[PDB]
């Protein structure tokens, strides 16, 4: 039963103020090939600034045709949309890293854990034929250290 639910998991990292950190977003327990992912990741914008959101090109193909769309227009929210522009050739069919979130730790960030949360209500995962797939999310965190 566990492997029938595909999981989108945000990783756990640490760093000090002024440095950047790279947080993996992983897809695991892929069964039905995935043709659409829409996810929102929340972060504390008082502590972190998004520098970039980079797809893992081993899994995410056809980026020239907008297979990977990132919306960082709302501070504290990262919206990632994966689609297969060809509707056939490049679903996500095996486990792996989907993307890396590149954050700056702000000079004033106070020490300790800060959660990176996936909104379960807006999470969308569907197959190549536009049918919703059983899915779940797992949250991550950045720990600010010396």
């Amino acid at each position: 039963v566990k492997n029938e639910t595909v999981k989108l998991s945000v990783g756990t990292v640490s760093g000090n103020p002024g440095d950047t950190v790279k947080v993996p977003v992983t897809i695991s327990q892929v069964s039905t090939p995935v043709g659409l992912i829409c996810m929102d990741i929340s972060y504390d914008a008082s502590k972190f600034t998004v520098k970039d959101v980079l797809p893992n090109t081993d899994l995410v193909k056809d980026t020239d045709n907008y297979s990977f769309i990132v919306n960082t227009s709302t501070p504290g929210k990262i919206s990632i949309t994966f689609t297969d522009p060809t509707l056939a050739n490049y679903p996500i069919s095996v486990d792996g890293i989907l993307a890396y979130l590149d954050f700056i730790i702000n000079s004033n960030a106070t020490a300790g854990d800060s959660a990176l949360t996936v909104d379960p209500a807006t999470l969308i995962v569907a197959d190549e034929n536009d049918k919703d797939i059983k899915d779940a999310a797992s949250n991550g965190k950045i720990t600010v250290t010396g």
């Binding site: 907008y66 769309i69 919306n71 949309t81 994966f82 689609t83 509707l87 969308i124 569907a126 536009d130």
Partner: protein
């Protein structure tokens, strides 16, 4: 660009636009939402406008 008329513009709408532009008959598509730039045609420029909405709005 809310092609499935669920009240939000998101990746589901992009998939449906791509399906329409690939020649598929798309069930539950709102025709009046397809010509996003209002130039009378439904084409890759409408898809581009939809992508920009998802990317920026």
């Amino acid at each position: 660009g809310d092609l499935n008329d669920d009240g939000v513009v998101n990746g589901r709408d992009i998939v449906m636009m791509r399906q329409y532009l690939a020649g598929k008959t798309v069930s539950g598509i709102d025709k009046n939402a397809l010509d996003i730039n209002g130039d009378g045609a439904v084409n890759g420029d409408d898809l581009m406008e939809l992508i920009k909405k998802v990317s920026n709005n």
